[PDB]
Enzyme design. Structure first.
Site, mmCIF file in Angstrom:
data_model
loop_
_atom_site.group_PDB
_atom_site.id
_atom_site.type_symbol
_atom_site.label_atom_id
_atom_site.label_comp_id
_atom_site.label_asym_id
_atom_site.label_seq_id
_atom_site.Cartn_x
_atom_site.Cartn_y
_atom_site.Cartn_z
ATOM 1 N N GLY B 17 0.831 -1.188 0.000
ATOM 2 C CA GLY B 17 0.000 0.000 0.000
ATOM 3 C C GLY B 17 0.867 1.240 0.000
ATOM 4 C CB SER B 20 -0.595 11.306 1.391
ATOM 5 O OG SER B 20 -1.523 11.355 0.322
ATOM 6 N N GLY B 22 3.877 7.749 3.236
ATOM 7 C CA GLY B 22 4.692 6.551 3.242
ATOM 8 C C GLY B 22 4.180 5.371 2.437
ATOM 9 C CB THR B 23 5.372 3.253 0.122
ATOM 10 O OG1 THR B 23 5.108 4.539 -0.452
ATOM 11 C CG2 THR B 23 4.841 2.168 -0.803
ATOM 12 C CB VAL B 24 3.612 -1.014 3.531
ATOM 13 C CG1 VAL B 24 3.927 -2.409 4.049
ATOM 14 C CG2 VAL B 24 3.238 -0.086 4.677
ATOM 15 C CG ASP B 129 -7.947 3.324 13.836
ATOM 16 O OD1 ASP B 129 -9.168 3.088 13.926
ATOM 17 O OD2 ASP B 129 -7.349 3.394 12.739
HETATM 18 C C1 LIG Z 1 5.586 -2.377 8.202
HETATM 19 C C2 LIG Z 1 4.883 -1.691 9.368
HETATM 20 C C3 LIG Z 1 5.682 -1.053 10.305
HETATM 21 C C4 LIG Z 1 5.095 -0.419 11.375
HETATM 22 C C5 LIG Z 1 3.721 -0.428 11.514
HETATM 23 N N1 LIG Z 1 3.165 0.292 12.664
HETATM 24 C C6 LIG Z 1 2.041 -0.030 13.559
HETATM 25 O O1 LIG Z 1 1.343 -0.988 13.477
HETATM 26 C C7 LIG Z 1 1.838 1.086 14.605
HETATM 27 C C8 LIG Z 1 1.897 2.466 14.690
HETATM 28 C C9 LIG Z 1 1.639 3.100 15.887
HETATM 29 C C10 LIG Z 1 1.329 2.307 16.993
HETATM 30 C C11 LIG Z 1 1.275 0.915 16.925
HETATM 31 C C12 LIG Z 1 0.888 0.172 18.250
HETATM 32 C C13 LIG Z 1 2.154 -0.126 19.111
HETATM 33 C C14 LIG Z 1 -0.064 1.052 19.112
HETATM 34 C C15 LIG Z 1 0.043 -1.079 18.032
HETATM 35 N N2 LIG Z 1 -0.613 -1.998 17.910
HETATM 36 C C16 LIG Z 1 1.538 0.277 15.703
HETATM 37 C C17 LIG Z 1 2.899 -1.050 10.579
HETATM 38 C C18 LIG Z 1 3.495 -1.685 9.503
HETATM 39 N N3 LIG Z 1 2.624 -2.346 8.527
HETATM 40 C C19 LIG Z 1 2.683 -3.815 8.397
HETATM 41 C C20 LIG Z 1 3.409 -4.802 9.099
HETATM 42 C C21 LIG Z 1 3.272 -6.135 8.727
HETATM 43 C C22 LIG Z 1 2.418 -6.449 7.648
HETATM 44 N N4 LIG Z 1 2.268 -7.869 7.236
HETATM 45 C C23 LIG Z 1 1.387 -8.248 6.128
HETATM 46 N N5 LIG Z 1 0.655 -7.217 5.406
HETATM 47 C C24 LIG Z 1 -0.218 -7.617 4.297
HETATM 48 C C25 LIG Z 1 0.790 -5.837 5.788
HETATM 49 O O2 LIG Z 1 0.189 -4.979 5.210
HETATM 50 C C26 LIG Z 1 1.717 -5.476 6.962
HETATM 51 C C27 LIG Z 1 1.850 -4.125 7.334
#
Ligand SMILES: Cc1ccc(NC(=O)c2cccc(C(C)(C)C#N)c2)cc1Nc1ccc2ncn(C)c(=O)c2c1
Ligand SMILES: Cc1ccc(NC(=O)c2cccc(C(C)(C)C#N)c2)cc1Nc1ccc2ncn(C)c(=O)c2c1
Lengths: 251, 252
Positions: B17, B20, B22-24, B129
């Site tokens: 994904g 606006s 960042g990107t994963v 959230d």
């Molecule tokens: C790569 C990444 C890094 C950091 C975060 N951050 C969070 O989740 C975040 C941001 C703020 C707070 C929290 C807390 C600690 C509150 C929780 N829960 C979490 C998300 C991601 N996204 C992420 C991580 C693993 C994934 N595995 C499969 N698929 C298909 C995905 O789309 C995917 C996305």
């Protein structure tokens, strides 16, 4: 990071093992946890130092195939807390159970084991005791590497005779590969301990690789061989080990 | 002890994904990793500081049902790395998929979700959230909580203007229980969103618990109700919430 755990929060359940440092209790703390504990009312500096250092290495780990380090408590007792592991070790599944694994699942385990191992060596950590006994199949799907509570078959030659190295772990990973591809412990016919110890250390005795499965890919056999090269220098590194195994899996 | 990852160690690609900001990317780093990167823009002070705090909390989290924090990168770009998650979110499994779950799995999810939440609040963290989209079924068995507007999970006191507290998360967890115990999104029959926003804040709109599954245990009905109680103060706490769920599960 934030590693210290509020003290009176943990409640200990059924004692499970005697561990390598302290008794181990299946506990409960925001879910299922495992706790290796020391029950001395006051810790000798020896006992305290093993605790201080055991935490020091775990402080560095964050990988899905490495056991999850959750924190420590200093004041009710010197305690270390990790996730609880649902299922049984690699050792039990191959040897102490009837169930044979699918060749796919067999390499997948070897794969995840490599990933966990690769990550460990990357952070400059030496395991010093890789074996199927210390490899846990959490939820029968996910490999979890740890140190639980006598490892002789996985010992590199130079260890039999600073002998612990990245290459000594590599060799140890080789023996584990034998377990996965043969369903067997090496030197199954040799009875005496001193005989195995001496013959393997002298460089005469090496695992019988003919017992590998028919389904076992030819390339997998070659990698397993390289890991068990008598000369520690001639052993591959886990980057290449991890590399090869994954490329195999894609096919 | 130090979590920053040296450049070129991670090999990216397979983007999933794109925000606006960042990107994963499905990445490769000692196995399968996921990498959130700020390669959409030079970081605005909001997002850049949001980044700094997002790592600061992830540094503190150490739980089996919380997403795994593996490190961060500064030099190719500002990036955050986590474990890869095998499967689809709870949202997808319940609503956007054929797969209906066995009542056992619904409780197991509910229990693991509670465990992750309990651990979060214990470390004085507010999620802000909670929804079925932000709950990932790793390997289709293990629940992983993370953060990846959405208002069905919005507490009444949040519609009106702390407003974000632990009690607002409890309500959000309540809606998730509704999703799990009904296989449905609340107000599925109500059409326009703007009516919902006001009525949920006003006390007019309440989830229809008659839509609850037949298999759902009586204790679950009560707990689910209590969690989405209009009065935020009289709403239960996750320690107490988790308590009932485990003993409920223990009898099966
Ligand atoms: C790569 C990444 C890094 C950091 C975060 N951050 C969070 O989740 C975040 C941001 C703020 C707070 C929290 C807390 C600690 C509150 C929780 N829960 C979490 C998300 C991601 N996204 C992420 C991580 C693993 C994934 N595995 C499969 N698929 C298909 C995905 O789309 C995917 C996305
Ligand atoms: C509770 C505990 C705490 C710390 C350690 N320590 C280590 O494994 C250790 C100590 C030093 C180095 C390493 C490294 C990083 C080298 C590895 N691997 C690991 C083990 C344990 N044992 C432990 C942990 C989780 C468990 N889940 C289910 N079952 C049924 C168990 O028996 C069990 C045992």
């Amino acid at each position: 990071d934030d590693w210290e755990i509020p003290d009176g929060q943990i409640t200990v359940g059924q004692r499970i093992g005697s561990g390598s440092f302290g008794t181990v209790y299946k506990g409960k703390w925001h879910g299922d946890v495992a706790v290796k504990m020391l029950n001395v009312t006051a810790p000798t500096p020896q006992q305290l130092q093993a605790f201080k250092n055991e935490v020091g290495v775990l402080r560095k780990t964050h990988h899905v195939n490495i056991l999850l380090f959750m924190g420590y408590s200093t004041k009710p007792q010197l305690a270390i807390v990790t996730q609880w592991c649902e299922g049984s070790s690699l050792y039990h599944h191959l040897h102490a159970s009837e169930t044979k694994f699918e060749m796919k699942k067999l390499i997948d385990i070897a794969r995840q084991t490599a990933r966990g191992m690769d990550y460990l060596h990357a952070k400059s950590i030496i395991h010093r005791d890789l074996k199927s006994n210390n490899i846990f199949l959490h939820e029968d799907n996910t490999v979890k590497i740890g140190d639980f509570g006598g490892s002789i078959l996985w010992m590199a030659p130079e260890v039999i005779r600073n002998p612990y190295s990245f290459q000594s772990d590599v060799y140890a990973f080789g023996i584990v590969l034998y377990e996965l591809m043969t369903g067997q412990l090496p030197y199954s016919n040799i009875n005496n301990r001193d005989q195995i110890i001496e013959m393997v250390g002298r460089g005469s005795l090496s695992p019988d690789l003919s017992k590998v499965r028919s389904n076992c890919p030819k390339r997998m056999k070659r990698l397993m061989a390289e890991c068990l090269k008598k000369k520690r220098d001639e052993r591959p590194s886990f980057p290449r080990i991890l590399a090869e195994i994954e490329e195999l899996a894609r096919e």
